[PDB]
Symmetry: D3
Subunit: 167 residues, 6 copies
């Protein structure tokens, strides 16, 4: 019917506009997601590095009071491997297997020399926080349902493409 | 009209597909929200605990230089209660009402003994950062429009169910 | 056709409800975005302030062991200006141009006196972490595709209004 | 002969006076000896006590730098008995035979309690110079031709009497 | 009788020589006395000054461990006057009567300014051993049968003259 | 005359005994002198060595507070030679002419190696009192009317022999 006709025609003009609005809104919602995910995945890294430095500070103070020290976590906030011998004294750094020195030196951020293993012990003693007058005078002997981060970042990437290709 | 008929029929085949695409997109947008909310509500807790440890470190250094100390916040980043007497010396921990010791010991993270109140003073003196040679030799006398976090986490939960039930 | 008629009429009653559901869902998705953005932009500020305090703690310990000190970042986690002379000793604070003192004092959080420039050097020496027995006895001479934070916060604001005005 | 007579008579009057002068001189020489001997035998005691305090000071500084300590002599400048176990750590004071504690406590000057052996370990740890933050927090477990000085002082005494009795 | 005569004459030649020998011996005995008395009365002064410096060292170490200090004797090994208020803190030096500052400053060896009483408090705080980081930052408010030594030294002097005049 | 005769004979028996008494007294006076001179010339040496150790203690404390150091006298209480460059820092020990190192090492008591000059700098840095955490980590580059004591001791020796030979 003719008025019925034109009812549907105006209803065209409504609905198509409406769906265009929702497509626009969803595009910009997805952009804000992808940006917020990066800005949060940068704090997690900065906070983990601050945590390693905080534990090292505590060790330095304890050595000033002549007390033993405790454990220090790696870059990325994971406990040192349970295979590795603990470290509470210079004398513990002294007897390390030359292959458990590299795991520690890579764990913390230090940048060492791959061919000149003269001073690796002292690198590690400074990284752990063993700087006191008795420790600087020691004389090391030579070597004998849940998702994860990148998951949902990738999820957003494919979701954006999936929505784009159908427009 | 017959071509008019088939115009509408193809328009079926378009629009229903379109609405299915938007339902798919909104489901996965909501999942990324729920996961990002947890990953951020875990940093807030980790950062608050780091803040308590940072203030305690500052107190330890100040005691090494023989100066008075300052305030230390609880687990969850809230100032100690304003009713509680301040703490700047061992002699302030010494005269605590035995019921203002438990609020402090619960505030910080320490795990004490509920029946053996012999050493609660020393627990608290270590938690606040009162470790110096003069403080370890002290000899304590015996007791005589905005939303919040869980709000919008719950909001996401009900929103997900609300959308699911209508599909 | 009459059954064809009523098919379309029931199809009214379906589709309009469906679009109302998606408008509701998108409103509350946008609210959760705007709240999460603020709760994350508050951690970034708190973490930056904690970072300045952490570097200052490291300097204090180094002075306890009689060693030189290093650089300390501002409130908001940006390296001091490259024009400014570095600071590693009291004697470096002593010879500062009276106009490079205000940049440092504003950089760190200290609140100074604008007319009584007697003690600005000591303010800065405490802000950087130069508190040791030799430094407290020094006797300063007188003066002779990526988006950013607020971008996408504003984006959310306009996006919310844009969606509201079309409902 | 008469002039010969009077020559001898005047020679009386000379010689007897002369011997009286030498007796007077020797009396006061002997008094100055007896007084100088005491004034020197008081410095030897004061210097020996200062030596014990000087070694104790050296130990305190070494503990401030977190290093081991050395030996401390008794009141009267004699090395501790060679039977006694050495002392370089708190853990060495901890395992002492309860009868090698009294020799040390008598050696140094400390005045202890003969019946209340609760705190003898801490007395000794302070006497040797073991005061550092780690040592004040330790928690000791309970017990399971030449002459000499007085020679020649006595010599002077008898010499004075010997000369007096013959006048 | 003639042989009797010559017996006495040879006895002359003996006895006079003998008395000359004893006079010579007593002269040089008295010289050695006068020299030994000075060489001993110089150690007593040197040892007394060393004792003041030793007590001051002990106070400095105690302040490094953040403990209170004790008494320090004057140049010449006499306890500070019993009228004078004791000194165990900076806050005790702060409230001194401006006339009990001069007795202390004269007691110890310091050389002050008689007209410029600006810095007398700090002179005294260094003389007593109050150098720690908290004490260097304090901000003092402005002022509102026995003989003795010389006895027997004089005795030797008169004794030497007494013997000389009779030869 | 006969009674005159016997008067002189009894006067024999008196005077000869008297002179024998004075010879006995002077012998034992001289022995006490020779023994007291040694017992005093041993304190002077012990006190001089204590003085070197006392100045070294003062330097160690000053380094704990991060301050510069002062001069230290030799074994025998004489100021270091005025030709020698002063020492107030590690960097002053570093640039020493290799021939001003031996004068210092002989001055203080240290016993070095005459052919292995590797570690002479560190010997001297410990002898002067330069032990702090910054100084143990430094990395030295390689070398490019009055009498005196023995006078009057000898005087007593010859005096004793002189008196003996005439008896």
């Amino acid at each position: 019917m003719d008025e019925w006709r034109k009812s549907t025609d105006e209803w065209r003009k409504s609905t198509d506009e409406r769906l265009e609005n929702l497509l626009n809104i969803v595009r910009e919602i997805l952009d804000v997601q992808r940006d917020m995910r990066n800005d949060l995945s940068n704090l997690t890294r900065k906070v983990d590095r601050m945590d390693m430095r905080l534990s090292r500070n505590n060790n330095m103070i304890m050595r000033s009071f002549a007390q033993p020290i405790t454990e220090v976590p790696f870059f990325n906030g994971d406990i040192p491997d349970p295979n590795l011998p603990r470290i509470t004294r210079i004398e513990d750094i002294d007897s390390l297997s030359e292959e458990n020195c590299t795991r520690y030196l890579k764990g913390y951020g230090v940048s060492y020399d791959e061919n000149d293993q003269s001073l690796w012990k002292r690198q590690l003693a400074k990284a752990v926080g063993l700087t006191a007058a008795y420790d600087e005078s020691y004389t090391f002997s030579p070597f004998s349902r849940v998702l994860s981060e990148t998951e949902q970042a990738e999820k957003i990437r494919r979701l954006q493409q999936q929505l784009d290709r159908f427009a």
